[PDB]
Scaffold this active site. Structure first.
Site, mmCIF file in Angstrom:
data_model
loop_
_atom_site.group_PDB
_atom_site.id
_atom_site.type_symbol
_atom_site.label_atom_id
_atom_site.label_comp_id
_atom_site.label_asym_id
_atom_site.label_seq_id
_atom_site.Cartn_x
_atom_site.Cartn_y
_atom_site.Cartn_z
ATOM 1 N N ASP A 35 -22.733 -8.793 2.977
ATOM 2 C CA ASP A 35 -21.550 -8.377 2.683
ATOM 3 C C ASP A 35 -21.159 -8.292 1.356
ATOM 4 O O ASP A 35 -20.295 -8.885 0.718
ATOM 5 C CB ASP A 35 -20.350 -8.467 3.396
ATOM 6 C CG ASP A 35 -19.114 -8.318 4.112
ATOM 7 O OD1 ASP A 35 -18.312 -7.595 2.813
ATOM 8 O OD2 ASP A 35 -18.117 -8.641 3.868
ATOM 9 N N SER A 199 -16.131 6.249 -9.409
ATOM 10 C CA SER A 199 -16.877 7.847 -9.045
ATOM 11 C C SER A 199 -16.194 8.834 -9.671
ATOM 12 O O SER A 199 -14.909 8.296 -10.545
ATOM 13 C CB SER A 199 -16.553 7.965 -7.785
ATOM 14 O OG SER A 199 -17.623 9.183 -7.184
#
Length: 330
Positions: A35, A199
């Site tokens: 994770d 992004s």
């Protein structure tokens, strides 16, 4: 040194991936959920409340010649889906894919919430976010990657998740055969303890790319792609019959639909998520309504590039002094 381990979907939907990890001496192999959105290595164990264990393989520290209780130390964690676990702490030898760390904090669960109990395939978590998020008290402990770092050939790990198929976690090297084209690297902020990056925008299907900054985290422990409501609405507007259902808990669509791809930007590069990756199947057994793999992050407080996004790429987690993330197509 290096390590290389195969990671395998737990079910036919890629809800999560499990990676075998050797703990203790002789080795006890547990299947852990790697994770990158958390920083605790915790396991079902001989100390876990018996009624909260249901099919998981447990770590038994009393059977390990290398286990030692970290006296007085405790841990307690809550995750975004509302699940939680807590317990005490051992140090022991932990190996992943041939890479061994001695003195790794192995957090032994005394209590786990129902979602963990109910998932027989996950024996615990191995956190790969920054150690500043580790929940051990009174003294925070280091992640497996943080402990391994100085011994690694290069201070990196890579995630290469498969679509309906196994993939690979590598430590200490970049497999240049595992991706196409070049890896584009982008800046990371560690301010919130995550692999947080920005992004450069998105496209829906064959649409033109929209240049817009989207801050979010690279999180292998989250199934879906969670993005701002504007972006997500623009995506589902291109799917006939799609709608947001408050009763179901997100966007649903007719299982017969052809889903467009979704493109996200990494600098001047682009990663294309095929439409099929966005299909998470019937909302309930036998339904003709399907659950979407791109959902709104509104109310989470952060955008999450989870498995739906990450499995479309070869992803480099660069733990150099100034961390970065790299993405390549594959």
């Amino acid at each position: 040194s290096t390590g290389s381990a195969t990671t395998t979907p737990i079910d036919s939907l890629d809800d999560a991936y499990i990676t075998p990890v050797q703990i203790g001496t002789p080795a006890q192999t547990l299947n852990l959920d790697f994770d990158t959105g958390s920083s605790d290595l915790w396991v079902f164990s001989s100390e876990t409340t018996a009624s909260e264990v249901d099919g998981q393989t447990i770590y038994t520290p009393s059977k390990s010649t290398t286990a030692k209780l970290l006296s007085g130390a405790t841990w307690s964690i809550s995750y975004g889906d509302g699940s939680s676990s807590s317990g005490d702490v051992y140090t022991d030898t932990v190996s992943v894919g041939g890479l061994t760390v001695t003195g790794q904090a192995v957090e032994s669960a005394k209590k786990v919430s129902s979602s963990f109990t109910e998932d027989s395939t996950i024996d615990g978590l191995l956190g790969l976010a920054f150690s500043t998020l580790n929940t051990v008290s009174p003294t925070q402990q280091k992640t497996f990657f943080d402990n391994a770092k100085a011994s690694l050939d290069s201070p990196v790990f890579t995630a290469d998740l498969g679509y309906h198929a196994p993939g690979t976690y590598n430590f200490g090297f970049i497999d240049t055969t595992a991706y196409t084209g070049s890896i584009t690297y982008t800046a990371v902020s560690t301010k919130q303890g995550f692999w947080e990056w920005t992004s450069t925008g998105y496209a829906v299907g064959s649409g033109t790319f929209k240049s817009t900054s989207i801050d979010g985290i690279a999180d292998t422990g989250t199934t879906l792609l969670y993005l701002p409501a504007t972006v997500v609405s623009a995506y589902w507007a291109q799917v006939s019959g799609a709608k947001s259902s408050s009763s179901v808990g997100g966007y649903v669509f007719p299982c017969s639909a052809t889903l467009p791809s979704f493109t996200f930007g990494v600098g001047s590069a682009r990663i294309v998520i095929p439409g099929d990756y966005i299909d998470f199947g019937p909302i309930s057994t036998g339904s003709s309504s399907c659950f979407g793999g791109i959902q709104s992050s509104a109310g989470i407080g952060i955008n999450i590039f989870g498995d739906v996004a990450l499995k479309a790429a070869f992803v480099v987690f660069n733990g150099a002094t100034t961390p970065t993330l790299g993405f390549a197509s594959k």
